[PDB]
Amino acid sequence: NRINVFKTNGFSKSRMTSKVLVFKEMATPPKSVQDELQLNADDTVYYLERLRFVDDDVLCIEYSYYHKEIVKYLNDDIAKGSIFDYLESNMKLRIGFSDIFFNVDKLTSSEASLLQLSTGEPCLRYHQTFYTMTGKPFDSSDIVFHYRHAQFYIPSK
Amino acid sequence: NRINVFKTNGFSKSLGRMTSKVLVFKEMATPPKSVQDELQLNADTVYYLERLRFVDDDVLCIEYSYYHKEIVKYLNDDIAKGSIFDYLESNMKLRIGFSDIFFNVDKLTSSEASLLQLSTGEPCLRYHQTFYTMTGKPFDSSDIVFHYRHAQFYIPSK
Ligand SMILES: [Zn+2]
Numbered sequence: 001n002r003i004n005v006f007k008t009n010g011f012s013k014s015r016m017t018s019k020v021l022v023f024k025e026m027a028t029p030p031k032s033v034q035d036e037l038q039l040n041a042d043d044t045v046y047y048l049e050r051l052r053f054v055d056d057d058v059l060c061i062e063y064s065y066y067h068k069e070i071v072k073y074l075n076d077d078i079a080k081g082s083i084f085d086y087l088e089s090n091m092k093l094r095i096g097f098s099d100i101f102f103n104v105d106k107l108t109s110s111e112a113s114l115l116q117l118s119t120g121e122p123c124l125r126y127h128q129t130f131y132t133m134t135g136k137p138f139d140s141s142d143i144v145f146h147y148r149h150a151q152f153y154i155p156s157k
Numbered sequence: 158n159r160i161n162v163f164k165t166n167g168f169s170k171s172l173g174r175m176t177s178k179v180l181v182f183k184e185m186a187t188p189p190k191s192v193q194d195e196l197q198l199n200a201d202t203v204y205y206l207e208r209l210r211f212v213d214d215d216v217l218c219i220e221y222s223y224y225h226k227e228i229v230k231y232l233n234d235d236i237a238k239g240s241i242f243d244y245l246e247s248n249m250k251l252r253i254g255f256s257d258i259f260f261n262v263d264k265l266t267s268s269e270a271s272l273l274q275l276s277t278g279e280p281c282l283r284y285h286q287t288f289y290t291m292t293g294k295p296f297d298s299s300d301i302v303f304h305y306r307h308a309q310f311y312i313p314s315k
């Protein structure tokens with residue numbers, strides 16, 4: 001079947017499973033992450049690196065930064081499941097909207113390796129920044145999709 | 158600068174800038190099988206066109222479209238040089254309701270690579286859109302193959 005983007009959800013809400021590769025709390029976020037999440041050097045982010053699968057096929061690598069203040073608490077156990085359901089059901093976080101950017105590109109050497117493909121084959125680069133309902137950014141995510149396993153859909157109006 | 162999909166109009170209305178070169182325009186008394194299926198037709202005439210599209214003299218995509226003649230009423234290759242969707246709303250007064258969009262990433266065929274001035278096998282976006290009138294009548298089946306460098310997308314999600 002097919003991934004739906006319209007959806008500000010987790011992918012979990014489109015079957016899915018995950019290898020968490022990194023989870024950590026960073027005292028000083030990357031400068032890109034400071035910009036994107038309207039942060040400074042001082043306030044903490046969580047970083048999460050996940051390999052996602054759909055029905056046993058590698059779907060993408062996901063690079064996520066979360067604003068600890070807004071999200072309140074994450075750990076790698078909870079990173080094994082749906083972050084979005086944890087956020088709504090446990091943390092009771094009111095997620096409002098999101099900006100999505102994407103383009104097609106060639107894979108890097110290491111990316112082709114992660115996604116068991118060859119250097120330079122196609123991929124989709126997908127960025128998403130999630131906002132709370134009061135406009136505060138809390139999640140900046142970058143995904144590189146496996147070009148044969150990722151199929152997308154959207155309904156317009 | 159960035160192409161919005163959200164957003165059920167033509168690309169001329171979507172961004173700009175846009176110009177296009179019409180490569181093929183046929184009126185077909187017998188539409189292909191999947192076009193019958195998809196436009197929910199009899200074996201009903203459709204117009205077929207291939208269009209090579211540019212934003213600012215940069216090649217953006219190749220467009221392969223089928224239109225239901227009965228709903229669209231009339232189309233020729235001149236009208237096809239400009240915004241087909243403005244013609245449809247401004248002239249034909251067609252009420253456009255909604256659309257289904259499908260996309261995936263793939264490699265280019267040699268004939269697509271030539272048209273987009275890239276190499277056989279280099280990446281693209283294959284994008285499909287089916288448009289329906291405001292009464293749920295499907296009237297346009299479109300496949301687009303995007304230039305992977307020149308096309309950069311945006312969704313304002315909620
Ligand atoms: Zn999730």
Ligand SMILES: [Zn+2]
Pocket residue numbers: 167168169239240241242243
């Ligand atoms: Zn148009």
